[PDB]
């Protein structure tokens, strides 16, 4: 049709092409005009002229005030950080240095700087530069702790809530507990005078911290508290975050019934208020995929993660920690999905894209990198046992050994010796040593994984069932302790049947191992019994399988807020 271009966009093109000399007058333009000039500079590919203007807190504060166009600002900022210029570190250092010069000034400029720091730290937390947003929030905290007043207590507790989020995402859990204690101190000071701050976001962040620290029970308690402290006047972001973290704490506490409603309502809120192309909606989809993967809904869990990656990769450019987390989650879900197919080409592609990104942006001694190694190794080792070569298989086993060893050392250094994820690493090493034809160490690895996951978690949990299944597969096939293998198979089958019912997909390998065990030990009547049991299992597997997409189950909700929260809370007794 060849529609003539808008005079706004035509002048924007003319001004940008003149940017060599009109670079000082553009900084004095209205905020909506000024951002469009910089977006046109990005679209023309002139990132060096764009990056020399976003490295300044004053200029970046005027483009941060365009709240509707922040979905474009995130992509521009990611392009700048991929360009090579460290805009995130430069802006954080500029704000941290500039706040100290006015921390002794009047309260009005202090509040203006606190607002600018909230905007900038929120942007850098959304983008994923948690280490570069911790500086901004820390500086806001020193701005918030010089005058004794009600609103400064409010700003300080908000600073500690947001600073708890940038320390969970940076895997700084030994500072997060201190930050939460300081936040509780300021909140108790605020409630001392009779003004009660709202603790939904704080308790949600603490729940996310404790879940990340693999303290599932205390995370469940704190998410219960956060749901108890949800009101009607909360922002949608806080409600969505609390619902997501409560669902994640519930699904790892094997309460799939409450977690389903919580995360479905969270997805409905995120899609309704924000939209289908928002970073927060992408995070909510990522947590929804986590729930689906942990409730044996793998086929649509892969599709949900692919929806989460397609949003984060469209908003946050190419090389981001958020895109990296989406890649490492989609790689593991694809790995789980094709575990009975062997087609680990897309899963390995996503797992290697989640390490080539993090190694660029994060140090090698970072905890969040270690998980991305795990997802690769469980893929690579599998590619070893499906390939038709021997040297390739040995090389893949060596590489996966390096990955699991590095991840285990990182987990031991950060978390400690005895928690859930260190035992997950031990179980991974047990599986690897079973594949590496070294079963004497595999027995020890599985035994210590069982010990850690049984003295900390329950004796009837999903992870304990998974590890007893792994250990009994180690025994009945190679180590040949048939009594222990039989009892662990029965334990795993009982736990899986209790948790996910008969339709659990993880019972197939246990049934196959038990059939092989009985063929190797006798009792052919029991062999036929478990064979028809496996036939019934496959019948139930093919039945009720043609289910709709999980993004369709989250329709326009017939349950609103203060109904999902109330249903979750009143069911705790």
């Amino acid at each position: 049709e060849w529609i003539p271009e808008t005079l706004y966009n035509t002048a924007i093109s003319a001004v940008v092409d003149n940017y060599i000399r009109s670079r000082r007058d553009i900084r004095s333009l209205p905020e909506n005009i000024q951002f469009d000039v910089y977006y046109k500079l990005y679209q023309q590919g002139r990132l060096c002229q764009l990056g020399s203007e976003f490295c300044e807190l004053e200029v970046f504060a005027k483009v941060l005030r365009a709240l509707d166009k922040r979905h474009l600002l995130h992509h521009c900022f990611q392009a700048l950080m991929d360009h090579g210029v460290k805009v995130a570190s430069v802006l954080a250092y500029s704000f941290s240095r500039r706040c100290s010069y006015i921390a002794e000034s009047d309260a009005a400029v202090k509040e203006k700087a606190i607002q600018v720091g909230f905007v900038l730290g929120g942007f850098l937390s959304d983008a994923g530069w948690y280490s570069d947003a911790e500086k901004v929030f820390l500086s806001c905290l020193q701005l918030c702790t010089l005058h004794d007043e009600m609103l400064h207590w409010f700003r300080a507790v908000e600073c500690c809530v947001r600073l708890l989020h940038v320390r969970n995402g940076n895997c700084k859990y030994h500072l997060g507990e201190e930050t939460f204690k300081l936040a509780q101190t300021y909140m108790d000071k605020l409630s001392k005078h009779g003004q009660q701050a709202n603790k939904a976001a704080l308790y949600g962040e603490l729940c996310a911290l404790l879940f990340a620290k693999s303290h599932y029970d205390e995370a469940y308690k704190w998410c219960i508290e956060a749901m108890k402290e949800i009101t009607a006047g909360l922002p949608v972001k806080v409600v969505v975050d609390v619902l997501r973290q409560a669902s994640k704490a519930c699904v790892v506490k094997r309460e799939f019934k409450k977690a389903e409603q919580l995360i479905k309502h969270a997805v409905y809120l995120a899609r309704d208020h924000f939209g289908s192309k928002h970073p927060k909606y992408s995070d909510t989809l990522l947590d929804y995929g986590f729930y689906l993967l942990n409730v044996d809904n793998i086929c649509q869990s892969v599709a949900i993660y692919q929806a989460a990656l397609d949003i984060r990769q469209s908003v946050f450019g190419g090389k981001n920690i958020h895109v990296a987390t989406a890649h490492e989650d989609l790689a593991y879900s694809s790995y789980v999905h094709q575990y009975s197919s062997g087609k680990f080409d897309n899963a390995l592609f996503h797992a290697e894209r989640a390490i080539g990104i993090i190694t660029h942006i994060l140090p090698e001694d970072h905890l969040l990198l270690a998980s991305s190694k795990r997802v690769k190794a469980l893929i690579l080792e599998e590619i070893a046992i499906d390939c038709h070569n021997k040297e390739t298989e040995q090389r893949l086993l060596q590489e996966a050994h390096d990955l699991h060893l590095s991840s285990l050392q990182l987990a031991k250094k950060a978390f400690g010796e005895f928690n859930v994820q260190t035992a997950k690493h031990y179980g991974n090493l047990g599986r690897l040593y079973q594949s590496m034809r070294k079963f004497k160490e595999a027995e020890e690895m599985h035994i210590k994984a069982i010990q850690i996951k049984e003295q900390l978690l329950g004796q009837e949990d999903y992870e304990v069932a998974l590890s007893v299944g792994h250990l009994a597969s180690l025994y009945n096939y190679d180590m040949n302790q048939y009594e222990n293998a039989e009892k662990l198979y029965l334990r795993s089958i009982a736990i899986g049947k209790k948790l996910f019912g008969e339709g659990y997909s993880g019972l197939e390998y246990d049934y196959r191992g038990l059939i092989k065990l009985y063929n190797s030990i006798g009792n052919y009547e029991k062999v036929f019994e478990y064979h028809n049991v496996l036939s019934n299992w496959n019948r139930l597997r093919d039945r009720q399988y043609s289910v709709t997409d999980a993004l369709e189950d989250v329709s326009t909700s017939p349950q609103s807020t203060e109904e999902v929260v109330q249903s979750f809370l009143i069911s705790q007794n």
């Binding site: 593991y332 575990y339 597969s473």
Partner: peptide, 9 residues
């Protein structure tokens, strides 16, 4: 196959 899936991401 020989055994079950991989524990967590």
């Amino acid at each position: 196959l020989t055994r079950n899936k991989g524990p967590a991401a």
